[PDB]
Amino acid sequence: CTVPIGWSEPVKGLCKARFTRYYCMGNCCKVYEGCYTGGYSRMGECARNCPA
Amino acid sequence: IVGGYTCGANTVPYQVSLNSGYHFCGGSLINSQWVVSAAHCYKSGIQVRLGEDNINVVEGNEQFISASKSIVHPSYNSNTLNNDIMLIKLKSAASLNSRVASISLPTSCASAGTQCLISGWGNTKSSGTSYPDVLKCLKAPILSDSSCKSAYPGQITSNMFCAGYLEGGKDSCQGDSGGPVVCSGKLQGIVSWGSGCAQKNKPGVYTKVCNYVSWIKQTIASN
Ligand SMILES: [Ca+2]
Ligand SMILES: [Cl-]
């Protein structure tokens, strides 16, 4: 999944956890590692909800 | 840990990795059946990994133990991160040895200027991502409350302190949360939050463990 330059990505949390979350970025789900509470914990759950 | 160095295998024997299929937070072993971490690290399905150095290679000193209880502070506030502390009970007791050892709780709070040791398997880059195999370490001073509030006005409670650097380049980072800040042989802090990592004028913020001695004791006694 390639996110174009300028796209609005998820807001980085201030906490210092490294959760793995999958977020829909336009056409496809991309993995985000950090203090993220949004998106989905399972890639397939993101994918069936992407686009949105 | 950004701007730090290699601790050396099992030299931080109270350091644990919290794993849920991957490393997501650290913690600190405080007795054979209890770990201290951050409340914001709470999730289902936690395995505690003690005795780790390289978290991606079995080196033989690991103990893998499920978290049987994961107990956030009841007054943890997920918006302000006040009371950012959690206790994890181990399903079976750790076998304490030279590589897996508890860290003493504080009897009193630490003072500004004290150099502490902060450790973890978090990101080593302040922009982009590089997660280490082996445990990383940073020596960092406790900053004054007024300096902490200058950096983070309106955001610092009595249960938080700042430690690190104001000029950038040295900090804890994502993946270090929940892990130790040890000062003078005592667990004084828990890696909690900051404005990014290793940014100018934005030191790391840590849960102030000395305020929670009674809660920790009572929680352990009652669970
Ligand atoms: Ca290992
Ligand atoms: Cl999946």
Of residues B11, B181, B193, the one with CA closest to residue B106: B181
- Beta-carbon separation of A15 and B177 below 8 A: yes
Report DSSP state, residue A9.
Answer: P
Report DSSP state, residue B151.
Answer: H
Tell me, yes or no, if A10 comes closer than 8 A to chain B by beta carbon: no
Report DSSP state, residue B2.
Answer: B
- Catalytic residue from among B17, B53, B73, B84: B84
Tell me, yes or no, if A42 comes closer than 8 A to chain B by beta carbon: no
Ligand 1 centre and the CA of B99: distance in Å?
A: 12
Distance of alpha carbon B172 from alpha carbon B37, whole angstroms: 15
Q: Which experimental method was this entry solved with?
A: X-ray
Report DSSP state, residue B159.
Answer: T
Distance of alpha carbon B85 from alpha carbon B215, whole angstroms: 10
Strand extents, DSSP E, B21-155: 23-31, 34-37, 47-50, 63-72, 86-90, 115-120, 136-141
Which residues in chain A have their CB less than 8 angstroms from residue B197's CB? 16
**Closest ligand relative to B55 C-alpha:** 1
**Closest ligand relative to B56 C-alpha:** 1
Of residues B6, B63, B13, B72, the one with CA closest to residue B40: B72
CB-neighbour burial class of residue B75 (10 A; exposed 0-12, middle 13-18, buried 19+)? exposed
Residue B74 preceded by cis peptide, ω within 30: no
Tell me, yes or no, if B86 comes closer than 8 A to chain A by beta carbon: no
Task: Write out the H or E segment, with its range, that includes residue A29.
Answer: strand A28-34
Inter-residue contact B145 to B196 (CB < 8 Å)? no
Inter-residue contact B173 to B119 (CB < 8 Å)? no
State the binding site of B. 52, 54, 57, 62, 171-172, 174-175, 177
Which residues in chain B have their CB less than 8 angstroms from residue A17's CB? 24-25, 38, 40-41, 174-175, 177-178
Domain B1-12+103-210 part of CATH 2.40.10.10: yes
State the binding site of B for Ca(2+). 52, 54, 57, 62
Inter-residue contact B142 to B206 (CB < 8 Å)? no
Ligand 2 centre and the CA of A14: distance in Å?
A: 27
> Nearest CA of chain A to the CA of B31: how many Å?
23
Inter-residue contact B131 to B125 (CB < 8 Å)? no
CB-neighbour burial class of residue B187 (10 A; exposed 0-12, middle 13-18, buried 19+)? buried
Q: Which residue has the tokens 């007791």?
A: B93
Question: 3-state DSSP helix/strand/coil percent for chain A, to nearest 5?
Answer: 10, 30, 60
Q: Across the beta sheet with B186-193, what order do the strands follow?
A: B5-6, B136-141, B115-120, B180-183, B186-193, B204-208, B160-163
Inter-residue contact B38 to B178 (CB < 8 Å)? yes
**Closest ligand relative to B50 C-alpha:** 1
Distance of alpha carbon B218 from alpha carbon A28, whole angstroms: 48
Bridge partners, B15 (sequence order):
B28
Distance of alpha carbon B81 from alpha carbon B28, whole angstroms: 19
Domain boundary assignment for chain B: 1-12+103-210, 13-102+211-222
Kindly state which CATH superfamily the domain A17-52 is placed in.
Pancreatic trypsin inhibitor Kunitz domain (4.10.410.10)
State the binding site of B for substrate. 171-172, 174-175, 177
Inter-residue contact B145 to B161 (CB < 8 Å)? yes
Inter-residue contact B199 to B165 (CB < 8 Å)? no
Kindly state which CATH superfamily the domain B13-102+211-222 is placed in.
Trypsin-like serine proteases (2.40.10.10)
CB-neighbour burial class of residue A5 (10 A; exposed 0-12, middle 13-18, buried 19+)? exposed
